[PDB]
Amino acid sequence: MQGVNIYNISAGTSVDLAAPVTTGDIVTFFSSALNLNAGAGNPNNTTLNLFAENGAYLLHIAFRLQENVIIFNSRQPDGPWLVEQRVSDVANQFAGIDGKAMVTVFDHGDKYQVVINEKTVIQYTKQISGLTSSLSYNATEETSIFSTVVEAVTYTGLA
Amino acid sequence: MQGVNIYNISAGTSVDLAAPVTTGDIVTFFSSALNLNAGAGNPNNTTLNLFAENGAYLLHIAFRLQENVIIFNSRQPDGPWLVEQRVSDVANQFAGIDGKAMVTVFDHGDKYQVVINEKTVIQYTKQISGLTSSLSYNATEETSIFSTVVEAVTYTGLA
Ligand SMILES: CC(=O)N[C@H]1[C@@H](Oc2ccc([N+](=O)[O-])cc2)O[C@H](CO)[C@H](O)[C@@H]1O[C@@H]1O[C@H](CO)[C@H](O)[C@H](O)[C@H]1O
Numbered sequence: 216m217q218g219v220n221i222y223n224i225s226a227g228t229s230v231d232l233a234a235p236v237t238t239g240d241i242v243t244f245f246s247s248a249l250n251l252n253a254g255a256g257n258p259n260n261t262t263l264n265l266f267a268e269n270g271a272y273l274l275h276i277a278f279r280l281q282e283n284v285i286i287f288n289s290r291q292p293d294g295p296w297l298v299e300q301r302v303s304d305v306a307n308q309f310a311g312i313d314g315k316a317m318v319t320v321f322d323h324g325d326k327y328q329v330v331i332n333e334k335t336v337i338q339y340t341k342q343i344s345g346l347t348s349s350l351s352y353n354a355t356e357e358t359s360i361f362s363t364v365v366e367a368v369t370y371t372g373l374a
Numbered sequence: 375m376q377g378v379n380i381y382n383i384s385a386g387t388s389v390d391l392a393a394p395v396t397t398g399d400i401v402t403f404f405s406s407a408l409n410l411n412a413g414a415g416n417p418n419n420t421t422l423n424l425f426a427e428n429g430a431y432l433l434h435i436a437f438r439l440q441e442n443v444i445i446f447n448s449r450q451p452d453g454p455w456l457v458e459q460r461v462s463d464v465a466n467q468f469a470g471i472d473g474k475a476m477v478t479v480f481d482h483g484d485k486y487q488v489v490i491n492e493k494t495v496i497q498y499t500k501q502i503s504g505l506t507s508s509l510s511y512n513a514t515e516e517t518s519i520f521s522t523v524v525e526a527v528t529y530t531g532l533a
Pocket residue numbers: 257258259275277286288296297299
């Protein structure tokens with residue numbers, strides 16, 4: 216059965232999905248703000264994460280203004296960060312829409328397709344496989360590029 | 375190639391899709407407001423529509439607060455309106471989210487699954503088949519239950 220689930224994620228918190236995200240599923244994060252003037256992160260300004268049930272970072276999306284890049288990586292719950300994939304020119308990815316943004320992740324089985332607004336920024340070859348059972352939005356109340364609360368909407372049971 | 379498209383639909387207007395919505399695709403209408411104290415409709419307070427290339431209403435979603443029902447119907451290019459399907463208790467369908475709302479439509483080929491926020495309100499067996507090439511949001515300032523502008527996000531090329 217296809218379903219839609221909605222979550223309010225406050226900066227620095229995580230949520231367990233009522234409906235896990237697997238191959239064929241979609242998750243979109245909505246921000247009611249776009250603060251490209253957030254300044255230096257620590258080192259990240261904002262991160263959006265998809266976690267496996269074992270706590271592994273299946274997909275880690277990090278916006279780092281001080282380096283003008285968007286980083287994509289994975290990490291076992293007990294291992295070190297793996298190989299980073301980077302997309303340069305942050306402002307460029309959000310161009311066209313001001314004061315807000317949306318980041319969509321399509322779980323394609325072997326890859327995660329990440330779209331910022333209407334622009335696909337990367338076809339991320341997975342470094343770790345599995346279903347996503349938790350999501351998180353991490354940032355400080357001072358240096359995040361997104362609103363204090365980010366809304367996550369999942370479309371599951373699609374396949 | 376899976377894609378995300380965003381449209382800003384002002385009340386009383388329609389938009390042509392850059393990427394048509396077909397079987398397996400999804401469209402979600404986002405309202406930045408939810409006025410359940412709107413004046414009586416005549417008879418509709420708000421309607422959301424998916425049109426075929428020929429102008430047929432593939433799916434017509436009409437909210438009627440005063441009558442306390444949501445109407446689902448289809449209309450042939452030159453009319454007439456077809457068989458209406460109704461769902462009672464409008465307020466209850468939006469229960470869970472205050473001051474805003476989302477209506478999602480899944481095109482399952484033989485049916486359209488409509489979900490208000492997280493609740494599926496109907497599995498509408500199509501009366502008219504075909505590709506969705508445009509969308510519309512109709513309402514006026516005093517009768518609408520939604521915001522002046524409704525944002526529509528389409529997820530296509532999913533199948
Ligand atoms: C502070 C900082 O920019 N950290 C970067 C940096 O980390 C290292 C680690 C070790 C050494 N070294 O022994 O010489 C140099 C730099 O580069 C890393 C990539 O090579 C990371 O970018 C790291 O930041 C961390 O990135 C991960 C995701 O990959 C995650 O975002 C962490 O929160 C972040 O600290």
